[PDB]
Structure formats: C-alpha cells, structure tokens
Amino acid sequence: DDILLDAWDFQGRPADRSKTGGWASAAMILCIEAVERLTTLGIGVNLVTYLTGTMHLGNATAANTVTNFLGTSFMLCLLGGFIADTFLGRYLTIAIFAAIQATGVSILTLSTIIPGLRPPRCNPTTSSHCEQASGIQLTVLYLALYLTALGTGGVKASVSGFGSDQFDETEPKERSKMTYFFNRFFFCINVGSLLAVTVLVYVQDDVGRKWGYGICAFAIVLALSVFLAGTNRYRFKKLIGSPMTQVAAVIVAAWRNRKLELPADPSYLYDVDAAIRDQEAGVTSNVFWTLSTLTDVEEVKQIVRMLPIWATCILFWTVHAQLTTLSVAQSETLDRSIGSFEIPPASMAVFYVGGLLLTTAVYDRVAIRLCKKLFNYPHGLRPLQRIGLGLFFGSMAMAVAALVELKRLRTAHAPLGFYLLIPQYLIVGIGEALIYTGQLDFFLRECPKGMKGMSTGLLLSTLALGFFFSSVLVTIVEKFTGKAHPWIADDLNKGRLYNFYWLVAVLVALNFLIFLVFSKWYVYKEKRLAEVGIELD
Amino acid sequence: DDILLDAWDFQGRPADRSKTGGWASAAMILCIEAVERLTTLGIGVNLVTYLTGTMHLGNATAANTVTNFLGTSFMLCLLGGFIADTFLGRYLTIAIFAAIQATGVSILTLSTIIPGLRPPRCNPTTSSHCEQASGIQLTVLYLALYLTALGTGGVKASVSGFGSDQFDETEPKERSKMTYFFNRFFFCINVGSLLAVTVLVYVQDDVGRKWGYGICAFAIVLALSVFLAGTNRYRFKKLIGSPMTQVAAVIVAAWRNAAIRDQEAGVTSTLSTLTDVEEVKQIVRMLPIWATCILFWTVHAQLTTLSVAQSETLDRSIGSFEIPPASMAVFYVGGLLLTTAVYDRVAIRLCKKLFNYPHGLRPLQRIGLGLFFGSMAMAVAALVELKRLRTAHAPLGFYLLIPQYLIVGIGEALIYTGQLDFFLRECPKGMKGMSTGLLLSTLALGFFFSSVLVTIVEKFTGKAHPWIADDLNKGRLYNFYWLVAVLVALNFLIFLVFSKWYVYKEKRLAEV
C-alpha cells in the first residue's frame, strides 16, 4: 500500500510514499533545471556580443563560434541522456554534470575578470579596430564555454526525468499532487525565461560581464547544493536503457557480417533469421553485439523511414540560429532609445520568447477544441502539419528579415529607427512553437514500440545540425564574392546582410516543398506496408 | 578470479582488483581534502583581521567570532562523521557537505565584493570612530561562515575514510601502493600548509579579501567537479557503523528496577547488555583525561586571534617587503612540522631502544608534555606582551612573537599524537571511531572555552582598563595571557593526578 515496487530510496531499500515524495522534494531537484535553462539563454542569447564587444571579433566569426558552441551544447545533451540511460543514474548524471556546469561558468566568469586575459578595451563598429584577441585569451573563453556547453548538456538531459520520479505511483492522488505542482512550475520558467532574456541580459550588458556571468555561476553552485541536500528525500529510477543502443547493434553488428543473402524468406530461431543483415527494403516481424534478431532489425528500419522528414527539419533551426547571432549585430545598429531608457541589443530575443509563450497559449485554448468541433480530430494539428507550418515561417522570417535589412540600409546610407526587428524575432518565434510540437509528436507515435525515446535523439540532433549547418551556411558565403563587400560586415552599413537572410529564406522555402513530398510519400509507404503485412499474413 | 568482496560499485555490483580503485584514483577524491585543509587554514588563520579591519568589530568581540566559528566547525565535523556512518554514505557525505562548503565560501566571497555589504573603508588604527558592521552585513557574514563551517565540518569527517577506501584489500601487494601515494600526498599538504598561512594570507591581505576568499571558492568548485567526475571508478565500502550508537544504548537503557559505573564484571566477546555497558564504562574512565585536553586547545585559539592583533602592531618589516600580520602563524605550522619530523627520526628510534616502548613516549607522556608547553607558551607570551607594552609607552620586530607561535607548535604535535594515540589504544572492541569523536570534542570544547574566557574578563574589567582592549596599547593583554598560563598550569597538575589514577584504576580492571 504505502510501500512501492516502483522506486527505491537512496539506500536501495524499496521506496515509501509518505517518506520519499515531491510536494516539496521535487523542487530541490528541479531548481537545477531552472538555473540551467536560465543560464544557456542569458548566456547563449547574448554570448554573440561578448565576442564582438570585448573579444573584438568580426561579426561573422562571432556568429560561427556561438552557433557552434550552441550546437555543440545540443550534441552533448544528446549524449548525456545516453549516459544517464546506459551508465550513471538519472541522479548522479544530474549531480555530476551540474558540478561541471558550475566550473565552466566559473572559469567563464573568471575569464572576464583577471586582467590582460581580454584584449585592451575599445569598440569595433563605426569607431575603431583593436588587438584582435590573443591566442591565450581565446583558449580560456573556449574551455569555459565548452565546459559550460558540456555541463548544461548533461543536466538538460537528465534533471527533468528525475524530478518527476518523485510523484507517479500509478495511484491518482499523487498524479494529482503532481499535475497540480507543474502547471504552477512552468508559469515560473516561462515568466522566468522572459526575465533572463531581459533582466539577466541587462546585467551582463550594463553592469558588466563579471556580474552577469557571476550571478549565473553562483546560481548553479547554490542549486547543486540544494539538490544534493535533498538526496535522501528522493526515490530512485532503475536505469531506463537508451534505445540508441540496438540501433548501434544492427547498423554495426549486421555490418560485421556481410555475407550470403540467405533468403529462404525468413529462417527462425526465436525471432532471429545463423545471420541477420540489413537490406533496408521490407519484411515484417513481431515479438515480445554478435548476431542480430530480425524483429530487432526491422525496428531499426522504421527509424530509417522517419529519417527523410528528420532531414528537412534541420534547416528551420538554421533560421532560428540567425536570431541568436545576426539579428543581434543588426540590433547593434538600430535605435533602441526610449529616452532615459536604452534597451539591451540582444534583448530583442524577448520578442522571440514572447511569440513562443503567446503562440503556445493561443494554440492550447483556441486551436485544440476548435478541431474536435470542426473535424474528426480533437488533437489539433497531429503531427506533421505543424512541422510543415514551421518550415514555412522559417522562410517568412528570413524573407521579412531580408526585407528589413534593406529599409535599415536605406536610412543609414544618405539616424533613428527600430521596432523593425520584431517581426523576424516574432515569426521565428511563432514558427518554432509549432514545429517543435510537431517534430516531437511525430517522432513519438511514429517511433517503434519499445524503441521510442529514440525521439529526443531525432529531435535534439536536428537542433544541433540546424546550428552546425548555420555555421557551414555562413562559411560558404565567404567565398561567393569575397572581395569588396560580400554579405557579412563589421560596420554592417559597410556590408549587406539581406543577401544571407534571402538565401536562408529560399533554402528553407525549397526545403519545405521537399518536406511536402517527403510527407506525402512517407505515409503512402507506411500505409501500404501496414496493408501488405496483412495480405501475406 | 580477481574481484573483491565487501566492496561494491556505484551500480551496487561488486567489485575489482585491477580496474576500479587507484594509484591516482584516490588523487581525485583527495582533491577535496587538500582544498578543504588549505581553505580552513587560509580563512581561519586570518579571519580576525577581516573582522577588526573591515567589519570594525574590535578585538575582544572579533576574537570571539573567530573562535566560535572554529569551535562550531569542529562541533559540526563530529556530527558530520556520525551522519556519514549512520544515514548518508561516506561518498554522499563528502559530495553533499562539499557542495554546502562551496556555497558557504561563495557567499563569504560575495559578502566581500557586493557593494554596501560592509562598513565603509577605514582602519580603527588611524581612525577615531569606525562603524561596526550593521545587523545585516553581519547576517550575510554569519550565514556565510556557519555554512562554510558546516560545509567544512562534514567533509573533514568522511574524505579521509573514503579516500583510503580505494586501496583497502587485505593485501601486501596493492594495499602497499597505498603507502607510496599517501606519502607524496601528505608531504604536499605540509608544503601547501606552509603556503596557506603565507601566500593565501598574503593574497587576502595585500591583493584583497575578494581575491583571497574568491580563490578558495573556485578551489572546491574545482575539486567537487573532479571528485564527482570520478564516481564510476570508485570502490564503495559497506557502511561502517558509529561507535557512538553502541555508546548511547547504555545511556538510555538504564532506568530500571542497569548501569552504576564504579567497578563491575569483565567482558567476553533497546535493552542493555553488560559487555557493552562496561565498554561504555571504561570509555568514561578516560573522560577525566579527555577533560584535561580541552584547556590545551584554549591555548591554541589565542594563536588565531589576539596573537594576530599583537602581531599587527609589531614591526614585521624585512628590508623592503613587510610580512602580513596573521602570517606569523607560519612559525606555528613550522614548529608543528619540525617537531614531528624530528620525533619520528629520533624519539621513535632511540626511545624504544632503551625502555622497550611501542611509540616514542607513552601517550600520556606526550599529552602531559603538550599541556606543559601549552601552559608555558602563555607564560612567555604574557611576559613578551608585558615587555612589549612596557616599551610601547616608553620598535619590536615580529621576532618577539616567534616564541609563542613556536612553543605552541612544538607543544601541539605531541599533545595531538599523544591524545590521538591514547584515545585510540584505550578504546574497546568495536569503538575506534569513538577516538576521533573524543579528539575533535576536546578541540571544539577548547575553542568554545576561550570565548567564555574572553567574555568573562570583558565583563569584569571593562569598560575602564581592560585586559583585552580595542587599542592594544591601551590595555593589559599580558595578564589575560598570565591567566590562561596559570589556568593551563593548574589543569596540567590535575592531569598528573588523573593519569596517576587512570593507570592505577585501569590496571585493577585488567586481570580476570
């Protein structure tokens, strides 16, 4: 009754419901997730200008550095979950990796303080050119960045899952205590994330970096000690396995044997074909690294059916990557003067965060029940309709964003203009709050049974590439016409951005038509396969 | 097979010989020993100066805050090792109380760099009236300290236990790689222990508090990151119990128709059983001699506070450069290392080639020997302050303080390894972890005793011509030293009586 077979406590003796439980104890875990999100935002959003305001980089190579650090921090999150799942706990994953996050962000705060560890002070845009940055002073910014990248990476992966282990016995009153707890919790993260792209951005911009990154490092060192102090209060998961494992064990363990085709149709052992090898194409099997089992082989193959739609997602995230880097540099040249108020350059990102929060809010009330009464589905847009939708806004921003780099270059070649960068922030914002619903929802129900959780893998990995390809996309345009003014600049007025924003708009516009064809097809095949699996028994 | 029994994984799966544990794997776990020692030295040895200098409290009131912090830190270290062996892991303790220790020091660091979190710059030395810290700038300090002490206390308990747990196999082969490492390391400590009362002190004096305390913060936050990141490769012990609990079981369980002390039956091999109550009985037999060590540690505290305030006013110049006042404590650490260095090459070797001793001196010889130097340091120090003050009103180099700082250091080495060996070699079957409790206990109590001393004279002398005074040239500090000198003197005599009885009343308790 009171004791559960579902979890154990920090001893290992079976967990109890009125000893280990989350009306309180779920907070001490989760505050880490709060300080972490609030970090890679307050840092990541505005990391771009630190490199162009102090490190004195060229507005181009500040973008690549940031999108890479960002994308890197997204690859490393994909790994942390595999480590939580294969090797360490959920728990000592989030315990180990918050401590790591802490030194990275300490080494970072440190790098902005100790003297001569940043090039002597001055302003690059419209003013001067200074010192570059020493090869010494660039290596600590890297290690610290990349350490932070790794830290935020690992806990982003497991701190969420662990905090919810603190509630759900299938029993309702706990599930009620839980659902009660979180709707009150996210309003915070929301209202609190709105804080970090404004208030926190305000500090590192006005007061200075040391304080700005300092209040961060202190937050994780505070949080981690709250977390650990709750250790005994917690009840513990048994190591959910990463499904990414057998994907490795057929993509590889069917590679190590490439030999006689052996089509007898199917030979059996329990579920096995001996041999089993990957031909893609089709067969079908149902059941309940040396050699591989066929019912295992096929499950991988369903993962592969999802791959082309997986591909067409990457480019949205490139559009999103432009919001954190370039739209800052062109908020660097704009007005932003409210009189006695001067709004922080990278704080334009509050618009993007707004269109997230707002869209989600409009889409949970307005657009859900408006389908059950309108059509056969009360699910809203399930799933790939939201994905396609997002791709379209991917261009719609990059297209508008390309338009506004003209109205800006207009007035600045011949003083005051601003509030023209809302749309591109907003549009990527609304566009994001749909495509991430859709990417996710699709990756779930369409992921095989027992092998799902492959989802976040497909999800995050697209994020990562989105940034990495936005790194590549920038590095290509360097050679198109490289002399004179290419589309990149330092004084942006001495160069032209719109020529990039267009190309992303177009590259994405095409990407979306592609997605449409991939979308029509994928369902024709995953239907025919269903129907064929039956006809042949 | 290879695999070891009664050791496990973080998984819970036993175990290893040739993979998990290590030559340099302890090195990861003891990253956070060296840091916590180098911190509790650097911070404590000069904190009194942050109190008088920055917070503007003035010595009497400052000397007590420091000495309460040190006291509470040991008090908590004792609770710390009890938590560790009952509830928490050895591992979990060190993780958890390190984390606390890191915020604890962080907040302290933050206390020194956030604006308005102090009184405004001046030194009562050259200034007429300086504001003592406000109620709140106190509170962030106090919170920072007690966190830092709790943090430190908890770690101090379990890291040595978890550290040495990565070598134990009952093996002559690998468990002898334990020796080689634990030596390079221990040396590194004393080297780093010299630095913590010089360089660390120097930084926090002449670079600044924010830097000096700020480095210590980054030190654990660096170490905690290394320790936790070595978790997979650690050998995780079965949870060892607390001798404390078996000692409590007699104290509750006698209210009956159970325990009279005095003399009773001998021992062979909830409700209370006799072998455990006579075990608790002859733990009490040590308690009077435990009591006569409290007063040594009271001597020791005077080195962390008022002997700094004295040192602040002596010359301390060497040629051009000027040595930081609180860094006189190098002469104490030096005397402490030097005594050991010699006692092990000599008193071990050529004391046991005469009267057939096991250790150079009987534990009580070293205990008693400490108290005597302990009582004679205060006597020297009284007279020095006396014959410093007598020339203040008529300079004096830091040299005049080398004797107190030295004597106490020669004294302590003996009385610690006397105390430690006597508690250790007199304690019953399952209780040797009783020993460490007993030791810490005398220190917490010694420190806690000293603030009681200072407070008494403050009320019975001030406000007019006070023994411990704000301007040290304006009070008689020499007969607060005299007091502690004469106090420790009486305590010593009481020890000879106690230790005449102890070997007398515990050798009739021998033969059965």
DSSP H helix total and E strand total for chain A: 18, 3
Between the two ends of chain A, the Cα-to-Cα distance in Å is: 45
Which 3 state secondary structure label does DSSP give A454? coil
Instruction: Please tell me which of the candidates A96, A100, A225 has its beta carbon nearest to residue B102.
Output: A225
Residue B379: both structure tokens together: 């006597």
Please tell me the distance from the alpha carbon of residue A328 to that of residue A316, in angstroms, as a whole number: 18
Cα–Cα distance list, B115 to A109, A115, A211 (Å): 18, 21, 12
Nearest-CA distance B233 → chain A (Å): 11
Nearest-CA distance B10 → chain A (Å): 8
- B 96-115 near A (Cβ less than 8 A): 96, 99-100, 102-103, 106, 110
Asked if A22 and A180 count as a contact pair (C-beta separation under 8 A), the reply is no
A272 — phi, psi (to 5°)?
A: -80, 160
Q: Which amino acid is at B170?
A: T
Residue B155: both structure tokens together: 């770690």
Instruction: Please tell me which of the candidates A96, A110, A221 has its beta carbon nearest to residue B102.
Output: A221
User: Of the candidates A240, A237, A236, A298, which has an alpha carbon nearest to the alpha carbon of residue A266?
Assistant: A298
Residue B173: both structure tokens together: 């082969």
- Calculate the CA B108 to chain-centre distance: 21
The enclosing H or E element of A302 equals helix A294-305
Angle formed at CA A436 by CA A434 and CA A439, multiple of 5 degrees: 110
Please tell me the distance from the alpha carbon of residue B408 to that of residue B418, in angstroms, as a whole number: 15
Residue A370 neighbours by CB under 8 Å, 6+ apart: none
Q: Which residues pair with B236 in a beta bridge?
A: B8
The enclosing H or E element of B467 equals none
- B202-206 long-range contacts, CB within 8 A, separation 24+: B202/B324, B202/B327, B204/B42, B204/B46, B205/B46, B205/B49, B205/B324, B205/B325, B205/B326, B205/B327, B206/B324
Chain B residue numbers with beta carbons less than 8 Å from the beta carbon of A92 are: 10, 228, 231
Please tell me the distance from the alpha carbon of residue B276 to that of residue B249, in angstroms, as a whole number: 8
Asked if B510 and B286 count as a contact pair (C-beta separation under 8 A), the reply is no
User: Of the candidates B14, B123, B6, B145, which has an alpha carbon nearest to the alpha carbon of residue B71?
Assistant: B145
Asked if A223 and A98 count as a contact pair (C-beta separation under 8 A), the reply is yes
User: Which residue's entry shows tokens 């011949």?
Assistant: A414
Q: Check if A232 contacts B (Cβ < 8 Å).
A: yes
Please tell me the distance from the alpha carbon of residue A26 to that of residue A163, in angstroms, as a whole number: 5
Please tell me the distance from the alpha carbon of residue A332 to that of residue A397, in angstroms, as a whole number: 19
Helix pair A422-445, A349-365: axis angle to 10 deg? 50
How big is chain A by its Cα radius of gyration, in Å? 25
Residue B62: both structure tokens together: 């400052």
Q: Virtual CA dihedral for B68, B72, B75, B77, nearest 10 degrees?
A: -140
Please tell me the distance from the alpha carbon of residue A294 to that of residue A312, in angstroms, as a whole number: 29
Residue count (chain A): 537
Q: Which residue does chain A place closest to B109, by CA atoms? A: A218
Q: Which amino acid is at B391?
A: T
Between the two ends of chain B, the Cα-to-Cα distance in Å is: 46
DSSP annotation string for A462-496:
HHHHHHHHHHHHHHHHTTTS-SS--S--SSGGGS-
Asked if A235 and A166 count as a contact pair (C-beta separation under 8 A), the reply is yes
Question: DSSP H helical segments within A87-136, as ranges?
Answer: 91-111
Q: Do A92 and B222 touch (CB under 8 A)?
A: no
Q: Do B96 and A218 touch (CB under 8 A)?
A: no
Q: Check if A275 contacts B (Cβ < 8 Å).
A: no
Residue A108: both structure tokens together: 């970072």
Question: Of B9, B86, B155, B225, which to mutate for an interface test with A (greatest number of A Cβ within 10 Å)?
Answer: B225
Binding annotation of A: 320, 324
Angle formed at CA A90 by CA A86 and CA A92, multiple of 5 degrees: 100
Please tell me the distance from the alpha carbon of residue A143 to that of residue A146, in angstroms, as a whole number: 5
Q: Which amino acid is at B416?
A: Y
Please tell me the distance from the alpha carbon of residue A203 to that of residue B72, in angstroms, as a whole number: 37
Angle formed at CA A295 by CA A293 and CA A300, multiple of 5 degrees: 95
Nearest-CA distance A150 → chain B (Å): 13
Residue A310 neighbours by CB under 8 Å, 6+ apart: A458, A461, A462
Angle formed at CA B234 by CA B230 and CA B240, multiple of 5 degrees: 130
Beta strands in B285-393 (DSSP E): none
Asked if B369 and B415 count as a contact pair (C-beta separation under 8 A), the reply is yes
Please tell me the distance from the alpha carbon of residue B491 to that of residue B485, in angstroms, as a whole number: 10
Query: Which three-class secondary structure string do you get for A257-295?
Result: CCCCCCCCCCCCCCCECCCCCCCCCCCCCCCCCCCCEHH
Q: Do A95 and B12 touch (CB under 8 A)?
A: no
Question: DSSP H helical segments within A349-421, as ranges?
Answer: 349-365, 369-372, 384-411
Residue A424 neighbours by CB under 8 Å, 6+ apart: A323, A327, A397, A398, A400, A401, A404
Residue B244: both structure tokens together: 């404390």
Nearest-CA distance A88 → chain B (Å): 8
Q: What share of chain B is helix, strand, coil (3-state, %, to 5)?
A: 70, 0, 30
Q: Do A103 and B229 touch (CB under 8 A)?
A: no
Beta strands in A111-210 (DSSP E): none
DSSP state of B19: S
Q: Do A228 and B106 touch (CB under 8 A)?
A: no
Cα–Cα distance list, B129 to A336, B59, B126, B466 (Å): 48, 15, 10, 19
Please tell me the distance from the alpha carbon of residue B439 to that of residue B273, in angstroms, as a whole number: 27
Instruction: Please tell me which of the candidates A10, A99, A222 has its beta carbon nearest to residue B103.
Output: A222
Q: Do B221 and A102 touch (CB under 8 A)?
A: yes
Kindly provide the resolution of this structure in angstroms, with one decimal: 3.2
Asked if A102 and B106 count as a contact pair (C-beta separation under 8 A), the reply is no
Residue B227: both structure tokens together: 């320790």
- In 10 A of CB A203, how many CB atoms? 19
Kindly list the structural domains of chain B, giving each domain's residue range(s) and its CATH number in brackets, ordered by start. Answer: 1-512 (1.20.1250.20)
* B359 annotated ligand-binding residue: no
Please tell me the distance from the alpha carbon of residue B323 to that of residue A178, in angstroms, as a whole number: 60
* Half-sphere exposure at residue B503, Cβ-oriented, CA atoms within 13 angstroms: 10
- A 76-95 near B (Cβ less than 8 A): 87-88, 92, 95
Q: Which residue does chain A place closest to B11, by CA atoms? A: A88
Residue B465 neighbours by CB under 8 Å, 6+ apart: B475, B476
Asked if B154 and B73 count as a contact pair (C-beta separation under 8 A), the reply is no
Pairing mode, if any, of strands A3-9 and A235-236?
antiparallel
Q: Do A10 and B92 touch (CB under 8 A)?
A: yes
Chain B residue numbers with beta carbons less than 8 Å from the beta carbon of A87 are: 232
**What b/e readout covers B189-211, taking b as 16+ CB neighbours within 10 angstroms?**
bbebbebbbbbbbbbbbeeebbb
Residue B242: both structure tokens together: 């607390």
Question: Of B96, B100, B226, which to mutate for an interface test with A (greatest number of A Cβ within 10 Å)?
Answer: B96
User: Of the candidates B220, B189, B191, which has an alpha carbon nearest to the alpha carbon of residue A225?
Assistant: B220
Asked if B375 and B452 count as a contact pair (C-beta separation under 8 A), the reply is no
